[PDB]
Amino acid sequence: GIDLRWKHVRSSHRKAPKSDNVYLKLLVKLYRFLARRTEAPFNKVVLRRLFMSRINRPPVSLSRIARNLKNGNEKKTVVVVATVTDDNRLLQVPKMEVAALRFTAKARARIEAAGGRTLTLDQLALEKPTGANTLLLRGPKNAREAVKHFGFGPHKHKKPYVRSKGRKFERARGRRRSRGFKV
Amino acid sequence: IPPKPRKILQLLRLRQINNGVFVKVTKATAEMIKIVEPWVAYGYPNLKSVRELIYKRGYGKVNGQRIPLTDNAIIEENLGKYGIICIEDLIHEIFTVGPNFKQAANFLWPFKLSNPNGGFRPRKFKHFIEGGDLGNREEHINALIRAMN
Amino acid sequence: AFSKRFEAKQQLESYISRVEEIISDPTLSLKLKRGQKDKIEQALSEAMAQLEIEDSTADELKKKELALKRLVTKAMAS
Amino acid sequence: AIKHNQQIPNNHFRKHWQRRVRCHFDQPGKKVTRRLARRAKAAALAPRPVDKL
Amino acid sequence: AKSKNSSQHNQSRKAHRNGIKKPKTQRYPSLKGTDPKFRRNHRHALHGTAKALKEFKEGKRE
Amino acid sequence: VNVPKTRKTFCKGKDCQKHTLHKVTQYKAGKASAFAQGKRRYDRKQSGYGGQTKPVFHKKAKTTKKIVLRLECSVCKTKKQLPLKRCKHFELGGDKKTKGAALV
Amino acid sequence: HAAGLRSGTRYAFSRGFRKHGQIPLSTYLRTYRVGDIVDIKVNGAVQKGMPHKFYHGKTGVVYNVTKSAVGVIVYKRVKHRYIEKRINVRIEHVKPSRSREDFLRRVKENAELKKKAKAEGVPVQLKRQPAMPREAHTVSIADNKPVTLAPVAYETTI
RNA sequence: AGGUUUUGCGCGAGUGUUUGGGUGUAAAACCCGCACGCGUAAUGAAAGUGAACGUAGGUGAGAGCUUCGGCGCAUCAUCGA
RNA sequence: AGACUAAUCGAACCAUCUAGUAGCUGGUUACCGCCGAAGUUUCCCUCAGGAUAGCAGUGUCGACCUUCAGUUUUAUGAGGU
RNA sequence: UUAACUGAACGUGGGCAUUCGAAUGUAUCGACACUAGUGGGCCAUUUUUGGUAAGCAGAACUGGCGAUGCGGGAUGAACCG
RNA sequence: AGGUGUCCUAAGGGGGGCUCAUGGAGAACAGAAAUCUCCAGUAGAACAAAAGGGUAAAAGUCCCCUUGAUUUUGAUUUUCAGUGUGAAUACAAACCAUGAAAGUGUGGCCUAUCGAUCCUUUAGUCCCUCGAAAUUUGAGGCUAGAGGUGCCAGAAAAGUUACCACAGGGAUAACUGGCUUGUGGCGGCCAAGCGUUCAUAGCGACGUCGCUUUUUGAUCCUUCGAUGUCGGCUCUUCCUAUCAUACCGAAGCAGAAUUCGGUAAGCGUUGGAUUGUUCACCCACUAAUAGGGAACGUGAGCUGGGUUUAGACCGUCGUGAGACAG
C-alpha cells in the first residue's frame, strides 16, 4: 500500500488538434519544430492556440484591431490566430499589416485598399521566426448567446429558456410583488 | 487510521510501511511526532548509520523524479548554490545540523528499508518501555537500522 | 352549539364555587401570603362578568377554566 | 416530469397522429407531370401566348 | 413500516472529499449595505479628484 | 378592544402631505356584482348537463377575522385603510377605563 | 422539539454573579473605523440590536459605521462550503480585539531594530524561531547534597 | 417532430438553392430568383418612448511585446456615464 | 339456494376500441484498459415513489500564477459538560 | 461631518529589502459546462436515552462491511495482521 | 415537565417625582388580620399569559401631555436549497409626538401568538384600452389591503362484504425454531422466632444469590410463485427435578404406621361415568396409579367431534346492507 490521494491523473489541456484538416496538420508540424528549438515565448503560445476548438477562437473585428493600434503601436504586426471580420461601422480604415488564420472576403479587400498587407501564419514564421515586434489579440470569449443562460438561479439576473417572449410567458408569480413574491 | 494522525504522517512524508526520514527536533516538530505514537519508532542516529544510509539507499529528487545518486555531478547541480558539491558535504550537513539542513533533507527521497533481519519483538505494537517496538528508544535505534538496512 | 356551550358554563361555575372554600377556611389561608391572595380575587372579578354576557363561546369559557386553576394551584403547591 | 434546466415542452402529439402522415416521395414525379401538361397545352395554343395579360 | 429517522454518519467525509472551499479575499470590497448618506458624498468626491489629477498636465502642478 | 372615534395621522393627499385629523369607521365588504368577468364566466360553465364544475369549500377552521379601519381626512376627504390584528370583541368609541376606583 | 431565536441560551446571555446592574459607561466612548478587528460578546441587559446566538464569540471586520451600530463581516461554515455573513450589532456588544496587537507591535519593533544595524553593519536574525533543546551546563552539589527517596508502605486513612 | 449543451466543417453582419421554376445520360446530378424564417435593439399591463461628457471612462491584477521608459488582449473585482 | 340461462353466472358467449394503464414482480446478448459512489439535507394526500443540494465521470479553458493545507508552534477571544 | 481645512473615506509625490519578517509539506492551483447511479442500510471501541432484559428500539465523533480477495481466530459479511 | 389559534387606546410613545415583598417596636373601639408613625430591608415584590433570561433616582409605581400601532420603497439576520411564509435588526428620504435640553419613538422589555395561484371586494392616480371616428353609462388593466385553506407550501368527498377479484409484500401479523426470563416453575445462603425445655429432628420472618425453557409475555431474524393449522387412537426411543421396587444414612425412630436425605432411570406406572376438549372432577382395583422432551413427536398413518368458506335459526347492536374471541 502507498496511501495516495490521486493516481493515474491525466492532463487537462489538449495536446493535438481534433480537426483533420490536412493543411492545418502541416501548420502544426512547422510550429512544433519552431517551439522546440527557439527561446522565444511567442512560439509556444501560438502552438497551443492552434489546438483550440471554434468556440475558444472567437472572431476579431477590424474595429478591435484599430483600438489597439494607438499609443505607439502603429508600426507593429498584428497576429490573430482566428478569423478576421470586417466592421460596417468603421468608415476610415488605418494602414496596417495583419497575420491571421483566415480573412473574410470584405476584410481582405478593405485592408489592402487602404495600403495594407495580409499575411499568413506560414509567411509569418518566414519573416519573424522569433515574433519580434508583434502583438497578440483575442476575441470576446464570453460574447456568446449560450453563455447568458449559464448559472441560472434566484438573484442571479440570468436569461431563462422560454419558447417566446411576451406578457403571457412567465412574468407573473415570483416576478412581481403584486402576485405573491419576487424571485 | 483516524483523520488527524493520517494528515501528520503525510506532512512527514511517511506514506508507506518501512519508510524513513530525517527531522530536526524543535518544539514545533516534537509535538507532531508525539501525536502519531502508535505508528512510528524513532531515535538518535550516529555517524555510521547516517553514513550507511546515504551510500546504499541514497536517492535524490531531481525535477520530481527519483534519480539514484552515483556521481558527484548530480549533487552539485542541485545543491551547489548552498555550498554542497560532494557526497561528503551532504553527510556533514545532515549529521551536524547546519544552516542549510532544510534544503539538504528535502532533497533526499524518503528511504525505503526492508524488514529487519532478526525480526521484531514478540509483540511489536506496544511501547518500547512496555516491551514493544514503537516509540522513542534513544540510542537503541542504531541496532534496528542495521537489520532493516 | 347550544349543548356544547351550556356544558362548559356549568363546569366554570363549579370551579368558582370550589375555590371559594380554599380561600375562606382559616387553615389554608394561614400560611398563604397576601400577594397570592389578591391576585386570585382579581382574576375572579372578570370571571363573574362573562357569565352575565351572552357572546361568550366554548373556547373563551374553557380557556379561563384552566387559567384560574393554573393560577391557584401554583400558590398552594409552593 | 422535469429533471433539469429545460425549456417547457409543448408537443401536440396526443391524438392518433400516425393515422394522418403525408410523406412526399412524389416530388420529382409530380414535376415531370406538370411539364408534360404545360407543353401539351402550349401545343394546342399554337401561335398564342400561354398566359393572359 | 418504521424506518430510520435521521443520521449524520457520512456527511463529514462527503464534505472533505474535494475540500472545504473558502471564498477568496480581494482588494476592493463592494459598497453594498453602506449607509446612503456617506455613499452620495463619496460619489461627488471621486468625480472632482479625477478632474484635478487630469489637469495635472496643464495646470495646478501640486 | 376599543379605538378612539378620531385620530390625526399622515394624509397622502395632493395638497395636504402632512398630519391631519381623521374620522374612524369600520370597513364592510360590498355586494358582489352580477356583471363581473369572473361571474359571467362562471355562469356559462354551469349551464347544461354535467353538474357542479368548481370546488366548494367545506373545512373552515378560523373563528375570527382581521379588523380593518377606514379613515377619512377632514380637509380633502381622502380615505385610508389600516389593518389590525385578530380579535373577538371589537367596538369603537367606547368609554375609557378608570384607574384606582376598584369596587364590586 | 422547537427552534426559537433564543432557544438554548439560558447561560450564554445571562450576566454573571455580582455583575448585574449598571453598564460601565466607558463602552460608549470608544471609536471604530472600517477595517478594524472586533469580536462579538452579547450583553443580556440590552435587548435591541442583539445578534443571533451563533455569533456570540466570533471575530470579524468592521465594514460600515452608523449612528449607534457597526456592521461586521464574519465567515460561517455551512456543510462543505463557507459563506460570507453581514450583521448589524449595537456597540454595547462589540469590543476591540487584541488578536492583531502582537503583529502590530512586532512590525514597529522590527523596522527600528533593523534601521540601527544597517547603519552599524551587523546581521540581526530578526525573524522568530520555536523553542530549541537545552544546552550543556554543569550543576554543583556543594551545600546541595541530594536526598534519597523510596516508595511508602500501604496504610489505612479512615 | 421539438428543445439543450459539447465536437468537425462552410460562409460571416449577415446566413439558408430544392414550396416553386429552368434543365437532364431522368426519383440522381447541375443552375436561377421574388418573398419568408432566425440574427442585427431594448423596455412597459398599455398608450408609448428608444442607447458616446472622455482617444468608448477611472483604479488594482494580467499572457505577450518593448526604443527599457512603457503599451497592455481574454477574463475576474470595484467606482461611474 | 344469488339458484339456473350449452362442463362458463354476486351479471353469459364472440369480434373490435386494444400493443387498454401500472409508483408493483420477472428478464435485458462480445472482450480488454483507466477513474469510481449513495442510503443524508429541504418540500410534496409523501412513507415500496418523485423534484432539490451533496457524493461520481467526461470535455476543457486561465496561469505553470509559487499559490495552498481534516497539521504543529507563538499571541489573543468565546463555553458551563 | 466639525466652532474651525478640524475629521472622514479615496488619492498625487516621497521615504523603508544587505534580511518580504514561525515550523513542515506542496505525489496535485483556480474557474466553467453537461450528465449517470443513489435517496430500505447494517456492525464495533468510547460517550449515551427508553426497557427486568434481548442477536431489541433510538442518537453523537471516528473507523469498517455493503462494493474485497489474501495470511491467522478449527468453522464464521463486520474482530487481529 | 409544560405552552399557543388569544388579550390591550393603553397593558403603545415621551418626561418628572417616589421605592417594593417582609420583619422588629409603638397608637381609643381594633382582635392572627382594617388605618396612622419611626427604624431595618440586593429584590426574596411587581412587569396580561407557559418557562427561561433581564430590570432599583427603573423596564416597577402614581401624576402630566400625546397617537412612530403613520407615509415611500431597498439592504441584512433566524428556519434554509442560502426558495417561500412567519417573526426580527441597522440606516436613508418625509411628516409629527414628548422634554429646559442632550436625546428617545417605525406597536407590546427579549424568546410563540399565523396563510399562495384563480375569483370577489374596498382604497389610490385622474392615469392607460375597448383595435372605422367622437360624447356619456358599463366592462377590462396598473399599485396597496381584506374574504382561506388547522392534513396549517394550501384536492370538493359516507358505509358494508361470511358471495368475492387482481398486482405484490416475509419491508408487516396468526404456528414451530432463535436471542431474552419480567411473570410461571424449581433450588440455595444468613438466622429474629415456632417447636413444653432447646435458632438449625422437622420448619423459617425481614433480606439476598442462582438455575430451567413443559406457563404466559416482549421482539419480528428465517418462510406469504404455501413447511397441511385442536384433540384422541397407534408405535418407538431419550431426560431425572424418583410415585413404586433393590440396598443404606438421620428423627421429638419402643413396636406398627409415617417424615427428611444419598447411590440409582435396570423395571413398571391401569379399567370406567360426564365433556370435542387439553385441563378437571368423582367410582373401583393396585407394589404404584410420578413429571416431561422429540417442528408444543406422529393427517401421501387413521378419524373429522371442535375451530375456520358458501345454506339456515335465535338473542343484543345497527335507519340500512350487515357485525358479534355469544
Ligand SMILES: [Mg+2]
Ligand atoms: Mg503494489
Ligand SMILES: [Mg+2]
Ligand atoms: Mg391578486
Ligand SMILES: [Mg+2]
Ligand atoms: Mg533466518
Ligand SMILES: [Mg+2]
Ligand atoms: Mg510476534
Ligand SMILES: [Mg+2]
Ligand atoms: Mg430512509
Ligand SMILES: [Mg+2]
Ligand atoms: Mg464510509
Ligand SMILES: [Mg+2]
Ligand atoms: Mg365593481
Ligand SMILES: [Mg+2]
Ligand atoms: Mg379584476
Ligand SMILES: [Mg+2]
Ligand atoms: Mg347556453
Ligand SMILES: [Mg+2]
Ligand atoms: Mg356543463
Ligand SMILES: [Mg+2]
Ligand atoms: Mg338546467
Ligand SMILES: [Mg+2]
Ligand atoms: Mg434545541
Ligand SMILES: [Mg+2]
Ligand atoms: Mg455569560
Ligand SMILES: [Mg+2]
Ligand atoms: Mg432532434
Ligand SMILES: [Mg+2]
Ligand atoms: Mg434575410
Ligand SMILES: [Mg+2]
Ligand atoms: Mg413594443
